[PDB]
Amino acid sequence: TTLLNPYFGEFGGMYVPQILMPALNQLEEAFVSAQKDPEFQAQFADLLKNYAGRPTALTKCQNITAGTRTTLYLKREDLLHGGAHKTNQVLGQALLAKRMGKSEIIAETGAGQHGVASALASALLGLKCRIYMGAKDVERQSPNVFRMRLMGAEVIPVHSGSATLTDACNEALRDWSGSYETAHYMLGTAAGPHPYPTIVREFQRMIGEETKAQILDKEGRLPDAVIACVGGGSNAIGMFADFINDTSVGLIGVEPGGHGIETGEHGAPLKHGRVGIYFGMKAPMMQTADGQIEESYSISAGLDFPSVGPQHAYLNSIGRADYVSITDDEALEAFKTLCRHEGIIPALESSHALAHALKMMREQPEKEQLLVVNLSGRGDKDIFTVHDILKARGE
Amino acid sequence: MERYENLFAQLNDRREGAFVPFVTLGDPGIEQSLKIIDTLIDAGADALELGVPFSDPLADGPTIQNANLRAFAAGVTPAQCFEMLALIREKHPTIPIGLLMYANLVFNNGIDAFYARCEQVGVDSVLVADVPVEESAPFRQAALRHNIAPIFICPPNADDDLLRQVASYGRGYTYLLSLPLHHLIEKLKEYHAAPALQGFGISSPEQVSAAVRAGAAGAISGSAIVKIIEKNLASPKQMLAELRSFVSAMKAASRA
Numbered sequence: 001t002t003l004l005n006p007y008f009g010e011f012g013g014m015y016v017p018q019i020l021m022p023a024l025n026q027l028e029e030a031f032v033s034a035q036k037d038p039e040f041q042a043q044f045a046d047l048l049k050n051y052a053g054r055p056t057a058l059t060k061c062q063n064i065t066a067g068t069r070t071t072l073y074l075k076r077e078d079l080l081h082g083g084a085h086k087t088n089q090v091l092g093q094a095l096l097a098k099r100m101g102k103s104e105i106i107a108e109t110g111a112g113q114h115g116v117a118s119a120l121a122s123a124l125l126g127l128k129c130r131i132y133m134g135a136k137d138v139e140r141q142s143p144n145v146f147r148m149r150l151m152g153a154e155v156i157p158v159h160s161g162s163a164t165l166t167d168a169c170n171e172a173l174r175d176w177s178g179s180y181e182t183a184h185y186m187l188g189t190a191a192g193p194h195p196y197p198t199i200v201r202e203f204q205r206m207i208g209e210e211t212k213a214q215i216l217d218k219e220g221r222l223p224d225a226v227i228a229c230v231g232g233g234s235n236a237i238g239m240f241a242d243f244i245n246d247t248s249v250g251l252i253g254v255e256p257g258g259h260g261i262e263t264g265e266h267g268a269p270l271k272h273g274r275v276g277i278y279f280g281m282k283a284p285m286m287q288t289a290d291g292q293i294e295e296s297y298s299i300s301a302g303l304d305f306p307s308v309g310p311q312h313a314y315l316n317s318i319g320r321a322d323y324v325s326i327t328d329d330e331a332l333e334a335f336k337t338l339c340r341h342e343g344i345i346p347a348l349e350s351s352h353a354l355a356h357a358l359k360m361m362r363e364q365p366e367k368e369q370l371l372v373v374n375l376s377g378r379g380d381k382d383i384f385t386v387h388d389i390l391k392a393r394g395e
Numbered sequence: 396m397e398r399y400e401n402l403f404a405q406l407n408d409r410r411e412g413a414f415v416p417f418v419t420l421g422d423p424g425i426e427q428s429l430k431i432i433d434t435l436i437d438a439g440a441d442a443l444e445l446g447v448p449f450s451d452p453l454a455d456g457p458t459i460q461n462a463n464l465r466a467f468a469a470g471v472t473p474a475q476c477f478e479m480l481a482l483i484r485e486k487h488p489t490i491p492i493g494l495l496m497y498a499n500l501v502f503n504n505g506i507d508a509f510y511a512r513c514e515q516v517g518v519d520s521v522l523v524a525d526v527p528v529e530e531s532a533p534f535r536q537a538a539l540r541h542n543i544a545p546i547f548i549c550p551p552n553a554d555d556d557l558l559r560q561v562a563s564y565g566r567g568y569t570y571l572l573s574l575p576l577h578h579l580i581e582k583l584k585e586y587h588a589a590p591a592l593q594g595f596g597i598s599s600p601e602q603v604s605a606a607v608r609a610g611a612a613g614a615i616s617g618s619a620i621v622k623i624i625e626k627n628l629a630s631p632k633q634m635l636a637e638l639r640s641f642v643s644a645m646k647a648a649s650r651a
């Protein structure tokens with residue numbers, strides 16, 4: 001049995017080899033215990049406040065909306081230690097590892113953002129961190145590899161299979177299957193097998209909780225909609241969770257449209273994929289006709305995955321949340337717009353969320369609407385990508 | 396599943412264990428794979444476990460990962476694998492054929508239709524690598540409706556409830572990855588489980604004889620056959636010779 005429901009409607013589950021089920025059951029029990037433990041909550045609150053810097057600002061952006069009836073706030077997860085919302089939940093999961101008596105963390109990484117978050121939580125809490133990374137990825141990610149190594153993590157090149165993310169994830173889970181007595185697998189989004197979608201949501205829900213309190217203080221009401229980008233689904237579920245029962249509040253998730261949905265080069269499985277079973281979950285995924293998992297694409301590495309967390313699929317299915325897509329070109333324009341008009345350099349991931357809010361405004365400029373964008377991270381990492389694109393097309 | 400029942404009854408009459416090799420279908424290409432599989436049976440394999448190449452396997456070790464990737468290099472698709480399976484069955488009427496699948500390839504075009512295709516081509520069992528007993532209901536049910544044995548792994552970390560479930564739900568054989576080994580075997584028998592095949596790192600004759608002494612019904616070699624394929628890619632002839640030698644030796648060890 002489980003203590004909690006592993007499913008969101010038809011989506012989710014625990015589709016792992018039998019050997020991993022005790023590890024998932026152990027983690028579920030420790031999470032359920034922790035959530036009832038005031039000392040755990042106080043330790044987590046302490047790290048979020050005094051180490052990560054919560055609460056994060058809620059910024060009202062006036063220049064962008066001038067001359068329209070849109071009021072736009074940005075929830076500043078870009079200001080969290082580490083430069084993105086990822087820090088929130090890795091701190092929680094590190095505390096869970098310690099609760100289970102573990103001193104070691106396993107993670108895998110492709111572009112390296114979750115690897116850096118895992119390494120920083122591990123460094124602070126004195127945990128021995130090993131991050132599996134496909135050999136092809138190590139070669140292409142020197143900056144992130146260096147950050148992880150500076151923070152004392154062991155970055156382990158994986159050369160088997162295609163020597164990329166899949167192969168690193170396999171090796172990490174193979175490791176975990178043997179070492180789960182002493183090591184915790186630190187999954188980097190609200191996806192994978194139960195209990196991870198549940199844990200990651202609960203360890204990100206302060207995004208939406210703070211946003212609600214801040215918007216009640218500033219505007220004396222709830223937002224008309226909250227808007228978040230969707231890679232695996234963690235920042236969006238963290239923003240949405242505290243508003244799910246506030247039926248008047250729109251929940252808008254923005255998937256990457258890449259070069260355009262019609263090109264097939266995108267990462268929008270929730271609206272343009274097909275339910276499948278992979279990575280421990282039944283969830284929308286981008287699939288070949290014969291059930292191979294397709295390669296996704298986005299200008300933004302953080303969004304570039306062919307699946308999504310199961311709670312998003314469920315919220316979509318019942319009509320509680322709506323999901324849209326934004327192309328590379330739309331995200332780039334939003335990125336330039338925020339830099340010029342607000343002095344904030346946004347992550348290209350977050351730029352997808354801002355692009356959709358800008359469209360809601362520009363399409364209907366006399367519509368009264370109070371919007372919050374989850375600004376999931378800062379975009380220092382993206383300036384070379386942006387420069388290279390702008391230079392290539394001559395602008 | 397009846398091919399397993401008949402096999403184990405015959406082995407029991409010969410006081411013999413089963414030896415079951417694993418290979419990836421289409422590794423290193425379709426025609427070499429068919430030749431490999433014929434060689435395994437000719438050399439004494441009692442049954443086969445056959446993998447279908449999958450784009451993103453998250454439950455296979457390096458040796459198998461590499462085989463998976465080779466079969467893609469040959470452009471091997473699930474459709475082609477099922478063409479191969481019908482051929483194999485047409486040549487070998489009694490050899491039990493088991494598949495080792497990832498869930499998405501079973502779920503893709505409907506679970507029922509997957510098992511119906513297995514039945515049409517004459518597959519006997521399916522082990523779905525990433526479906527634990529807890530999630531197994533629709534797979535088990537579709538397997539049984541189409542006369543396919545659902546195979547479950549009994550892990551080393553297994554508790555009594557899990558032993559009872561695997562014993563209740565499985566057919567054909569129980570896949571043992573090995574509480575004390577002979578104890579697991581005794582409990583599985585107490586619970587009327589499908590006969591146990593030990594599959595933990597089986598690479599030498601003495602492990603086959605050990606399995607038989609422990610009272611398992613035989614042994615599965617999850618990766619040793621694949622290693623031979625990998626070592627011998629440049630010489631197909633030598634590849635078949637070494638596979639014949641290995642399987643001969645392993646089967647000899649089962650005759651206990």
Ligand SMILES: *Cc1c(COP(=O)(O)O)cnc(C)c1O
Pocket residue numbers: 083084085086113188189190229230231232233234235236302303347349350376377378
């Ligand atoms: C990782 C990341 C994302 C995407 O991950 P989610 O789990 O969908 O939140 C989005 N924005 C930034 C800045 C990220 O680093």
Ligand SMILES: [Cl-]
Pocket residue numbers: 002003004005006
């Ligand atoms: Cl429950």
Ligand SMILES: [Cl-]
Pocket residue numbers: 035036037038041
């Ligand atoms: Cl509490």
Ligand SMILES: [Cl-]
Pocket residue numbers: none
């Ligand atoms: Cl308190």
Ligand SMILES: [Cl-]
Pocket residue numbers: 126127128129
């Ligand atoms: Cl350490």
Ligand SMILES: [Cl-]
Pocket residue numbers: none
């Ligand atoms: Cl409150």
Ligand SMILES: [Cl-]
Pocket residue numbers: 562563564565566587588589
């Ligand atoms: Cl049985």
Ligand SMILES: [Cl-]
Pocket residue numbers: 594595596597616617618619
């Ligand atoms: Cl093996």
Ligand SMILES: [Cs+]
Pocket residue numbers: 065066067068069070071
């Ligand atoms: Cs305005």
Ligand SMILES: [Cs+]
Pocket residue numbers: 230231232255256267268269303304305306307308
């Ligand atoms: Cs995605």
